[PDB]
Amino acid sequence: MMLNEVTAVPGTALPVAEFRDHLRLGTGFAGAEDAALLSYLRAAIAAIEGRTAKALISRGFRLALTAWRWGDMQTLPIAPVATVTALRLVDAAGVETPVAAGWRLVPDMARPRIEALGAMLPMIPTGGRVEIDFTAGFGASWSALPVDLAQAVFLLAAQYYELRHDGAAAMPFGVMALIERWRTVRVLGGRP
């Protein structure tokens, strides 16, 4: 189980123009170039998509795993999923033969899971571990996000900008109190 992404987000989809309107606009001085700001939003998206297990820009992933968990399951970790592209099933060397039937993607923010039809799920050869490419995330743009999750990115990327090293300074709906409802709540630490 690796879950590397296919393509990174371009930066032209990130709101480097709307971040400085959060950062110094209305109150302040009309400071740094776009390459300094964009290094702080994706450093704040990747801090929140790691704490909440989300994706937020809807790029494409590839989940390559070696054993299914159940035979009617294997929940996917990145939460908002849509349109699992292919279920490639490589052999050892891998002429790379895909399968096209047997499973149904169930789009669900709780457990995005792959839930094969019936009771049997596509098995794995010896050495030829199965890979899933899926496109998980809210929307292709920034305007398709939930706004409280998009605000906590701006509240955090303005923290990484306005104070550089790990220095000193909790408000009611802060950074933590906004992403506490997008995190995954699980209480199974067990065998299944």
């Binding site: 669900d108 923010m109 709780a110 457990r111 009611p172 802060g174 933590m176 109190a177 506490e180 409802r181 997008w182 995190r183 995954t184 709540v185 699980r186 209480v187 199974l188 630490g189 067990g190 065998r191 299944p192």
Partner: protein
Amino acid sequence: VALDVHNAASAWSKALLDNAARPSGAIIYKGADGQGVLAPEQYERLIFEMETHHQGARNAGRPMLLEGGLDWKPMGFSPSDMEFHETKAAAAREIALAFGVPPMLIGIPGDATYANYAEANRAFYRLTVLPLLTRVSAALAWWLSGYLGAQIELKPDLDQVPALAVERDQLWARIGAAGFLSNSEKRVLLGLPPT
């Protein structure tokens, strides 16, 4: 009073099985703040991993990874048995005390006052049955003798009753082994017609 203590203490346990919330525990979600509810995408996830994996007889002991913020505080139920148990059994015996039955006959648990039921049944037909029936049959004896002219007496036989057999056989063993008096003199002691 002991009827009302016995009715209500059996209605105490009847009610307590019907309106009482024990939990097996509680999953506390404080949150990042001091308070926070969890989203309906999180609550349907939390029920599913609690229903499938953590409840039942088939799931006793799943080690329950509690994340940041979550906590499982298991509740108890400390008075479990015996809600008014010995006050009900004492009330159940002071009902039997008033009517006159010994507690062995109806089945009241407790100490062994009588030993082996042959003296408990004999104490029943001597303390609270034959005193009761000899007062009813004597009132039948006077009231019915107003209808026919001759006055009639009508009393319980206290013989061919099976509870007084331990009273009866030691009588038959007492004068039966008294070999000094003759055979016509011991038939008159037992209520036998001499021949």
